[PDB]
């Protein structure tokens, strides 16, 4: 694993000392080399999981996130290469360093076994994000947004830690697969119930429900492309991975400790998908769509069925990539205009003839057009939920419909009307942003082709 | 669709518009042009009957009864004119009706060909900046402090010089 | 009716447009610029047919239940290209 980390810990001094004319290219290409080397984990010949020490490990549920992160790093770099163009070399170097620290932390956590290490990394993820969001935004409320982000996250963090302590004491160790081979069952009293809470509350507060979805839009809006990318892609996924790895112990509590959370997740999926219709701000629309899909993820995580877990992982990866892509497109249309509003720029596709086909290929992946990992996940999760009850296809379908609606609303208020006549600032497409779109897409094709990699624990 | 209307209207134009609308809906009801001519002549007689009258009372009464009769005996699916709203060509070509300023961002390897036309753009824009500032004073001098204006636009009271605000009208692409 | 200033503005813009279009014209020499049946039959039926026959007959019929030839529709009397001794007809066909 050091083979993945150490070079990512060398990109930093590399950035510091390299000359301005060359740091961008050098660090970018070498981060791509890191992404490449990050595939050794896929030599999972047999079912014996990979273990490198008492301090690291890998797994089928973690490897995807690792590669996706090591591959979203350079895309953040590139998408962060036209703005802050008049900001000093030292400042842009700081930005690069923060991105790289995010990468390294995310890798170490998605790999680590001991949930306490996982937790310290899960909470160290903040500093770079808070910074990136406050020191490089474009509005004023970014401050309140960062505050909300930080404090939601830490409120979650605390009882999680307290329960990790209670465990480490009652049980002997915290190492995973030992928690498995020596788990037990609980008398199911108010004590163990509040323990279940203090263990899942943080992961949920992070992966937003209806009740606490508030810090997502502010972040994705006030913050720049890279922060938006990384939020929509991974910093949510951390909660899901933690919940998956930890729920192994709390059996059986999660049968009746789920109804409220499943209910909230579904209702929130619906209401947020509806708001996605009448939400002006494009990035806010995208954020609420992300909420709508992560609600499915959660409803599939709780009930603990194998189909459900595989669908969760599929939809997870798919949404990560697709949201990064949509945010790239938004930023693109913003740098030329400097207004997030959806109804200002209209009737494109007459001057950006190609870009549309990078807009289209995203929506179709949002509304679950097959053959896509998106629909595979949505469908397996709907199957699990139908088994768990026959009266949830209702909500699945309402969500599918409202999505099929607002995805096209977005396509049609930006690439289907008639062109304005005062947007003389429409610098044509840059090879760079076209490349970012292509790189976010192509992997969707290859994974639609061969998804056995992207299944999960149960496959 | 170039000139703009006044705020208020007059009995004259109201009656004219009612007439044209009713005649179109009649062309739609009664297909054959012979029947259309017949009933159009009948409507013309109906109008010429009360034409010479001038009492605002009878005017308003007849107009507001005429509009009700019209709305109650109109054609559900009328005859829309393709090139106008409601039709099957309205905006059909707006997807191709690009403006000019897309030109500037061409690449020189492309405007290499089509050289002549780009030899004349400059002397056109040159025909704009050289006579822009003047087009402002013509209004800022005649921006009557009375402050009660319409949307009309005065011409170049001088000779040789060009009018004001010709860019957003000239260069408007074709209809095709 | 039209006001005279309006008529004059119209004349100006009309004589401007009727020159802008004369301009948007383009002279010549711009745009500047620096058996087949059998060949198509070949390149669009044959080659793919070869590749696909390879695929089928050496990767698909070489696997347990890739292709499923529904059982043929035998009749009475119909003999068999295998051993398949003769088969019997039915009984009386009155009327």
């Amino acid at each position: 694993m050091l083979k993945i980390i150490l070079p990512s810990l060398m990109l930093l001094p590399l950035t510091w000392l390299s000359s301005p004319k060359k740091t961008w290219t050098n660090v970018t290409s070498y981060s791509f080399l890191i992404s490449l080397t990050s595939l050794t984990l896929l030599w999972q010949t047999d079912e014996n999981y990979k273990n490198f020490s008492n301090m690291f490990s890998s797994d089928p549920l973690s490897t995807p996130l690792i590669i996706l992160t090591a591959w979203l790093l350079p895309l953040m770099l590139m998408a962060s290469q036209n703005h802050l163009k008049k900001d000093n070399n030292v400042l842009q170097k700081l930005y690069i360093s923060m991105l790289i620290s995010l990468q390294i932390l995310l890798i170490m956590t998605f790999s680590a076994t001991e949930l306490i290490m996982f937790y310290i990394l899960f909470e160290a993820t903040l500093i770079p994000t808070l910074i990136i969001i406050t020191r490089w935004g474009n509005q004023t409320e970014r401050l309140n947004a960062g505050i909300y982000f930080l404090f939601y996250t830490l409120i979650g963090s605390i009882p999680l830690l307290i329960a990790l302590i209670l465990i480490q004491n009652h049980v002997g160790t915290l190492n995973l697969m030992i928690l498995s081979f020596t788990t037990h069952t609980l008398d199911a009293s108010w004590s163990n119930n509040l323990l279940w809470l203090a263990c899942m509350m943080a992961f949920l507060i992070k992966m937003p429900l209806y009740g606490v979805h508030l810090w997502l839009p502010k972040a994705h809006v006030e913050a720049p492309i890279a922060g938006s990318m990384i939020l929509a892609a991974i910093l949510l996924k951390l909660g899901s991975y933690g919940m998956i790895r930890i729920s192994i112990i709390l059996d059986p509590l999660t049968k009746y400790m789920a109804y409220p959370f499943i209910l909230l997740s579904l209702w929130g999926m619906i209401m947020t998908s509806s708001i996605c219709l009448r939400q002006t701000d494009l990035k806010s629309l995208i954020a609420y769509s992300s909420v709508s899909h992560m609600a499915l993820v959660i409803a599939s995580i709780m009930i603990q069925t194998p189909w459900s877990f595989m669908g969760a992982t599929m939809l997870m990866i798919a949404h990560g990539l697709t949201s990064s892509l949509l945010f790239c497109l938004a930023n693109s249309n913003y740098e030329r205009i400097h207004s997030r509003t959806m109804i200002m720029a209209r009737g494109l596709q007459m001057v950006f003839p190609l870009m549309a086909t990078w807009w289209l290929m995203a929506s179709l992946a949002n509304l679950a057009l097959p053959p896509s990992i998106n629909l595979m996940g949505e469908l397996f999760i709907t199957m699990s939920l139908f088994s768990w009850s026959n009266f949830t296809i209702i909500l699945m379908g309402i969500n599918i419909i409202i999505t099929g609606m607002y995805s096209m609303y977005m396509i049609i208020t930006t690439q289907r009307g008639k062109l304005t006549n005062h947007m003389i600032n429409l610098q044509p497409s840059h090879t760079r942003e076209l490349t970012l779109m292509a790189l976010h897409m192509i992997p969707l094709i290859l994974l639609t082709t061969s998804p056995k990699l992207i299944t999960g624990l149960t496959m | 669709a170039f000139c703009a209307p006044p705020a208020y209207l007059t009995h004259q134009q109201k009656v004219l518009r009612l007439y044209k609308r009713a005649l179109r809906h009649l062309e739609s009801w009664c297909i054959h042009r012979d029947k259309y001519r017949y009933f159009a002549c009948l409507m013309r007689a109906r109008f010429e009957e009360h034409k010479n009258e001038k009492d605002m009372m009878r005017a308003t009464q007849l107009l507001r009864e005429a509009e009700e009769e019209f709305w109650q005996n109109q054609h559900p699916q009328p005859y829309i004119f393709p090139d106008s709203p409601g039709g099957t060509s309205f905006e059909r070509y707006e997807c191709y009706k690009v403006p000019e300023w897309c030109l500037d961002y061409w690449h020189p390897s492309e405007k290499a060909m089509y050289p002549d036309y780009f030899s004349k753009r400059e002397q056109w824009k040159k025909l704009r900046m050289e006579s822009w500032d003047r087009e402002v004073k013509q209004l800022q001098e005649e921006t009557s402090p009375d402050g009660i204006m319409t949307e009309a636009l005065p011409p170049a009271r001088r000779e040789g010089d060009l009018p004001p605000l010709w860019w957003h009208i000239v260069t408007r692409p074709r209809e095709r | 009716g039209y006001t005279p200033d309006e008529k004059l503005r119209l004349q100006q813009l009309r004589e401007l447009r009727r020159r802008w279009l004369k301009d948007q014209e383009l002279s010549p020499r711009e745009p500047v610029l620096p058996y087949r049946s059998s060949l198509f039959a070949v390149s669009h039926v044959l080659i793919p047919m070869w590749f696909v026959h390879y695929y089928v007959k050496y990767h698909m019929a070489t696997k347990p239940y890739t292709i499923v030839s529904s059982k043929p529709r035998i009749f009475p009397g119909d003999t068999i290209l295998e051993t398949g001794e003769v088969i019997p007809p039915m009984r009386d066909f009155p009327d």
């Binding site: 007459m350 001057v351 950006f352 003839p353 044509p428 497409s429 840059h430 090879t431 | 690009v98 403006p99 000019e100 897309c102 030109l103 961002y105 061409w106 690449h107 390897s109 492309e110 089509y114 036309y117 692409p173 | 948007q24 014209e25 383009l26």
Partner: peptide
């Protein structure tokens, strides 16, 4: 034989 306005397309 007339012109046809269009965007860049080279990029």
């Amino acid at each position: 034989r007339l012109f046809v306005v269009k965007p860049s397309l080279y990029y």
